[PDB]
Amino acid sequence: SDEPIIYINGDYLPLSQARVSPVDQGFLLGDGVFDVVSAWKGNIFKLDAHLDRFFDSIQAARLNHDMSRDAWKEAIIETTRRNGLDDASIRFIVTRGEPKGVVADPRDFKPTCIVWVAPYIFLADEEKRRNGIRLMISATRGFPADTLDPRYKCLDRLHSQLIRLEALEAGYDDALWLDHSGHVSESAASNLFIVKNGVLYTPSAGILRGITRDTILELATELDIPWKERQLSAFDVYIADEVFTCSTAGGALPVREVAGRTIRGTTPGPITQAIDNAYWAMRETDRYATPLSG
Amino acid sequence: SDEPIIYINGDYLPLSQARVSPVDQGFLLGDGVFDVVSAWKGNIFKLDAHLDRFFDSIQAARLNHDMSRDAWKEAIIETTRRNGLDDASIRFIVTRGEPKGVVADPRDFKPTCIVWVAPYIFLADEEKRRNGIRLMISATRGFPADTLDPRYKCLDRLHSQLIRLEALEAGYDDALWLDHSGHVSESAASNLFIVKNGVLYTPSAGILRGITRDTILELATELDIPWKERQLSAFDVYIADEVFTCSTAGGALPVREVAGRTIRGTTPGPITQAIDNAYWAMRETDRYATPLSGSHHHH
Amino acid sequence: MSDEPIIYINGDYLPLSQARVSPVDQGFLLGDGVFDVVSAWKGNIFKLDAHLDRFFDSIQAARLNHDMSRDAWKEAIIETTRRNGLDDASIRFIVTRGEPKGVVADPRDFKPTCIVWVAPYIFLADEEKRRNGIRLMISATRGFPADTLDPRYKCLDRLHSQLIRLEALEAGYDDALWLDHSGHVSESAASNLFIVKNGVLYTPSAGILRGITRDTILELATELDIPWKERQLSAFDVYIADEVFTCSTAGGALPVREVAGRTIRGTTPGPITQAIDNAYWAMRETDRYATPLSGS
Amino acid sequence: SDEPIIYINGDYLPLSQARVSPVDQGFLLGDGVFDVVSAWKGNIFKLDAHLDRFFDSIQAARLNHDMSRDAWKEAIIETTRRNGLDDASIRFIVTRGEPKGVVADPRDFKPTCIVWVAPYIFLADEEKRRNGIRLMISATRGFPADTLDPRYKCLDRLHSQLIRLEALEAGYDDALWLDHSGHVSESAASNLFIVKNGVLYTPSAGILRGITRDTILELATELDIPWKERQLSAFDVYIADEVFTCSTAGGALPVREVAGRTIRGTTPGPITQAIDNAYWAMRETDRYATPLSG
Amino acid sequence: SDEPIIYINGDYLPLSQARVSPVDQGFLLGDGVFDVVSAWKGNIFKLDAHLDRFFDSIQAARLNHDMSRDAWKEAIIETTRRNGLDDASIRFIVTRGEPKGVVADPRDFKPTCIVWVAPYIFLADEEKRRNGIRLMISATRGFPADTLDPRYKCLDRLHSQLIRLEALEAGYDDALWLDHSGHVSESAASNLFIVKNGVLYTPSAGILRGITRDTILELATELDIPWKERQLSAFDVYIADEVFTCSTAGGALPVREVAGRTIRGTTPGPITQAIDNAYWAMRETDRYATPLSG
Amino acid sequence: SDEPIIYINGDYLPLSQARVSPVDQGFLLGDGVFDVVSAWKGNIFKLDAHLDRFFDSIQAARLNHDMSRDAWKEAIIETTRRNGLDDASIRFIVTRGEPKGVVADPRDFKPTCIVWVAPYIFLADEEKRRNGIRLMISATRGFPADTLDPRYKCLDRLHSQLIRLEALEAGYDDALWLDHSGHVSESAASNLFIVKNGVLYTPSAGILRGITRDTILELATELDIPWKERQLSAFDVYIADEVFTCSTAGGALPVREVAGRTIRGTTPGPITQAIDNAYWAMRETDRYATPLSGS
Ligand SMILES: *Cc1c(COP(=O)(O)O)cnc(C)c1O
Ligand SMILES: *Cc1c(COP(=O)(O)O)cnc(C)c1O
């Protein structure tokens, strides 16, 4: 309409009316998980895959609760419909909620359940989408798997907010981080791909397993582009034939420079373009489409 | 009313009316820091040290904002007064707030500022405080300093919520974690102390530098108890003469067992008792006291 | 099969009650020895050659090479089992650096202690837990780095996992898995780990003892056209898996219904777990990889 | 000179008759801890400190058992007398024993308790004591504290047997190992000291806290020699003014070379000699002495 | 007219006269990269692949400069011609050069460009090639990827010179190093292969990606020998059926012993021999050859 | 502009004619160590301490060779005199040299010995020395002690050249690096100090033990400023009361910002200023001075 409409605990409310309690454990302790699915031209894309991953994060965090997957699916679709946006970024969130008493046991909780729908967003302006972004490598490393596993898509992102501040101060568009073995992982919003001698490579470990990343591997196979999940160092990225990131926010995004090394060739390169064009062509098929109308 | 009164962005509102926006970056991204100070019998204890630590976290997270240190002090005192408590647990929080402008630049923001005051809390019931608690060592490690430094007291604690899940499932009262070198660090709420041959030891690195921890070392010196900050492994804890944790939530807390190893001797041990008594004696005094009533200036 | 097990020790067959390890055996004082364990079921030893291969790998890596031939060890394994009158058995064979030889102990110059100990076949859980699944935790203790005491050794140096066992029992779990220092799941003291996700079988790739049961599971998966992958897995992968099971010469495949408070989704045992377990025991009621205690 | 007499589970038996069961968990699983104390000219030295450390390892490994500290002290003295010795190397061992019950629960066990006594031993021959030994640095690292803590003095030493094999193949007297941060730790038998500009230094972490090490720090203080526990790398050792190792087997032992770097100055150096002399002068007294007679 | 002729910044000079400035940043700071290609019987082998790798290292180190790849190729060919060696080891080097102004900015520099041609060299004498060499594992680890990436072939090799000192003092022919996870990486001159149960294995990470290593994998496929890139520990090496290293200096080199463990079976083993013979057969053809033609 | 004069293997030559061979192992393999001492108003400062460290590096790298410590000292002093500078940056270098005999064995070598004298250099311009520099934290870590120990002052610095390119591309004056435990170590040219509540702190491990760093600790004691060597994280630096780096190239250098965190209070802070003032006061005295001219 005017104000965004929020789904929150079963109610649809204008954002200015929707309320998280100041003692919600999602707020005080970061005790929640989330996922983000997108709509393009009236169709939500890979809603089932994103719900699968959401419920994976829920299982690992012991956030299992009574709201069915079907009810979550209905809430996602209906919240999008009520915001009237055909192109949208759709975030769904569950937290451990407000304390039952001062006797807090994370196995005994009433969840906070939210859907927030905003306009579709890219991660760079149109010029940088066409000519490529500049990335740096952060001084901050990714979380080890035995701390807060990167596989979680969760509320605990102060780490990457401070990386963002670092990137902006250094004059870069974004920053990738390494794992503690010095191999390139991902960025806060995106997974990383490189191309070398006609082969597509992407980090294997220490990452959130993006749905866009999954889709790019699927498209590569369909396009007869060989691909490999493997450990990559920054060196691999600097010498690559092509570099791009990918995210639900904008799909594939070409990279023209990493840490002062201009990627050789023209950016975007030919495999980057082929994958990008195939991604957006797939999204006008009925493959993985959930219509907001139908 | 017994409904809590909270400070939020300059207003004092009943908790049920106070609102955090669902798009607050403290909520969506854990982009916020916090601290907790306690009141006992009408005095806040070590308010200045807690404010200094809060503003350290703010500085490191680039959360600098327009509310001064003494405005936070006034908000802390006034929120406590409005809740009618002389014994209290006082949490104060700043977040990067709701996004400002089209493109979110964390250097340009309007903060969310909150004070939440509740009754004073201990980390264990009175029987466990008297006999000592049972701790395990978690399978989850602390954050490396080059990820999310343990020095931040911040909203990003899913890590320790899952550790708590595991501790409860395993039948323990709480869990310590190690750093990635295998040395004991801390727990989510507390720092760790041990005693060996009359000397007090506490981990040196990979921790939140607790104000209770600081106070314990100050008290040890006043009691002529030698102390050392050093790297400790779980082995050191199992074989210690005494073990205790410490937190603003309850002061010192004796530990009778860690990971199936019963700490030898009587629990609480004599140095634990001496430190615990000197702590609460210190707080029946005016030392590091900010009174809830009358003028709050130190003299 | 008596009230007194009979063991092989340095060429002699005698009751365990009488058999003697010296208090100054370096296997005792220093853990300077390696071992392996093979099983017999319904009159057949299973994969004896594979277990002997692994034993002699451990021997080679620890420079425990000695005179007793592989054929001699095979003969002693079979004969010790027969002397105990067992058709179902758990058979442990051990070599140590032995008692000090010479004045200056030099690990290249030694007289080994060679033992075969035979006991009834054992499972790692009782019948109800084999049927419904066990509960595992993740240990606070990590596996050994490859540059300390490589996990590839099957050796006597297991105080590490004895203390893990104490911790698991105190915590109310059936057993504990450990991680490596990168935080990826490795194994347990007795078993390797498998998970199932979306119809694919996964198992840790590094930082483990390469179990013979593990080898067999992968062979059986291929025979059943179940895709499999060796890869790094974190605890997260385990919590979210469709199915989880461990495997060991002690009992074969063992379903897992819960890890660290996360109940594995679906029914335990899951369909791939059941298919592999069934195929394992079917394989062993044949003569595939069988050495008959009979000789026939 | 007849065969050694061993204490085992309350009995004093000739070694040839003393039996560890093939299924003792100390044998099959290395489930046991040990300590070693020495006698010199009729006096056991620092018996109480060694018993304290033994019972520390017992506590950490949950090997608590019924044999009292007094009973262990009595067994240590009596076994030595029973072997007719006035100087001795005395090893005392407790294991988790033979399994008790149907279900192996390490919390419920019957221990194996052993005392093995032999003549006093040094770690190097006369010439090497006089002129110094040659050490290398192993390719094998010490155990991380969260695996099998170095603080345990335990039966699980295949690790250092293989280090010994490598040292002998390489032509060295012994090998030190590093921790995983690359700092020098210890050897299988000894702790490590260096001297630089008149100050004694010794590794602070990742080690067995030797009783000889403790004694060396006490003697340094008596001699007004400043000392520090600190992280040391191999570099620190190569450039040191003096280097020596220490152990109950032989006391201090000078080191003339590490990994091809000859330690500068005369070996043994002046502080090494002062500490060595003060240790043996202490050993000739009754300080920290438990006499074998009276 | 018998001494070596050096290419240096466009001039061909006797080695005696060729000069690196004492303030060249390749000298003072190790600020340079290099590669080495070989000639056999008048053919340079895989010159294009070695140039590809050289320009990879240049790209990663921001050593891009005005000398074209064709110019480098011509300089390599012509320098080899002028030295009159039909069998040769050809080293080509680029450094950041002498500081180019009052502010030293590594982005603005005039390079030092050198080609040095020497006789072809094996890494062991012919008897050791026949019987196999003896390798140890170094106490020194490889560089982490986030320090100085092992993917660089660069001037910064004090690390391996000290490892060589260690190996010689210990009486070994050479030393392998591990990465910080304890898995075998490589040596200063060579990559490492093992054979187990008819399959060829080689480390996957933490290494220079040798061109000889690439060639070995190609030859194995030609010979229908299965191969895998994977993490290997020292244990894997000790128990292997066969072990060999490989390098542009000498091709494949059999290994008969590692760290006191004699590799089982005959050395060289059958797969080692098959690959070695296939390598040298290839070197006697025009495959991948750039002829030296006057 | 007279040409610089270089000491090289016993000869004093104009830089233009001084030659390193393209096959010197210092060039091809980085097989060499070095140190740098400074002269100020005609006095070399702490020459003996720098020679001590140089010969420590030599010992650890087994670069032991025939040129005595006194011959090195005389070469350092004479090379400086011949360049006619009263303020100088003096670098002395030994490498494993050109290969000798028939097979290269690093235990048997003929060294390359060089002294290079240049004008005294600061690490930032006058405005930045006055108001403080801006530092970032590098994505590249320091060398582990069991790879190439940071205690070496050696020729193998491609690592820090690439860190420099990154700092310059990011718009910073320089970059600190951490060790692999995430604690702050040092920069290519300098050690790092912070001040918190009247106490001076500096990293304890994973660093070159600088002579300027040694001097700062000395001066702090002389000024009754407490100090500690300890592990510090980037967090410690952001929240410090004062931050400064130190080097033979320029002494103490104030730091006004690290990685977008402006250091609180006025830069340079009071302890930074007191130490800086005491450093240059010490250097205007006899203390640790070797005069360039005879007496
Ligand atoms: C969500 C996210 C991504 C992108 O995942 P998609 O499923 O493709 O949107 C990448 N990295 C991180 C850290 C993320 O949180
Ligand atoms: C706040 C907290 C403590 C306790 O600190 P105090 O200042 O004594 O209340 C200990 N550890 C962690 C992780 C904490 O967050």
Ligand SMILES: *Cc1c(COP(=O)(O)O)cnc(C)c1O
């Ligand atoms: C022996 C053992 C196993 C199981 O191996 P199997 O050959 O299948 O019996 C697994 N992990 C460890 C650590 C073991 O010692």
Ligand SMILES: *Cc1c(COP(=O)(O)O)cnc(C)c1O
């Ligand atoms: C026992 C031992 C020592 C020496 O300790 P002392 O108490 O002095 O005999 C040193 N290192 C290790 C690994 C040891 O086991």
Ligand SMILES: *Cc1c(COP(=O)(O)O)cnc(C)c1O
């Ligand atoms: C160059 C080199 C090799 C061998 O590579 P080739 O291309 O086969 O000559 C192996 N390891 C290292 C460290 C090297 O520098």
Ligand SMILES: *Cc1c(COP(=O)(O)O)cnc(C)c1O
């Ligand atoms: C030389 C250097 C320093 C400064 O040392 P000074 O002796 O004070 O000049 C600091 N860090 C590194 C890495 C250096 O090489």
